[PDB]
């Protein structure tokens, strides 16, 4: 029984060393954590119908009042973008819990 247990432990070392397969359950979480954040980073590049996605490119070109008609677009988009990510993250968290 000791020899068998030691043999079976040897088969786990070989199984997990000689390939990478069983850990996909952990890996997909570290992947989704990153991918959702990477998507939220990328969503800063989005225009949301403004003349630019970039803030200084508006503020250097327009005055105060004409900037806002662009800036509130970017705000509306970026606020909904965070709310989307936080809805995904709260939902995701429930699974991990």
């Amino acid at each position: 029984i000791a020899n068998q247990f030691n043999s079976a432990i040897g088969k786990i070392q070989d199984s997990l060393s000689s390939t990478a397969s069983a850990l996909g359950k952990l890996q997909d979480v570290v992947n989704q954590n990153a991918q959702a954040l990477n998507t939220l980073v990328k969503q800063l590049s989005s225009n949301f119908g403004a003349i630019s996605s970039v803030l200084n490119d508006i503020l250097s070109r327009l005055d105060k009042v004409e900037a806002e008609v662009q800036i509130d677009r970017l705000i509306t988009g970026r606020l909904q973008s965070l709310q989307t990510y936080v809805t995904q993250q709260l939902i995701r968290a429930a699974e991990i819990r």
């Binding site: 570290v30 954040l37 939220l40 980073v41």
Partner: protein, 37 residues
């Protein structure tokens, strides 16, 4: 397992940091988790 940074003294996570997307550490260190184990 193969991560891309984890809050270890500062690249996907340079950009995340430069947008205020901070990653906080766990309370329990990987040694503590190994000790409990």
């Amino acid at each position: 397992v193969t991560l891309a940074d984890a809050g270890f003294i500062k690249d996907l996570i340079c950009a995340q940091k430069f947008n205020g997307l901070t990653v906080l550490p766990p309370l329990l260190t990987d040694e503590m988790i190994a000790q409990y184990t």
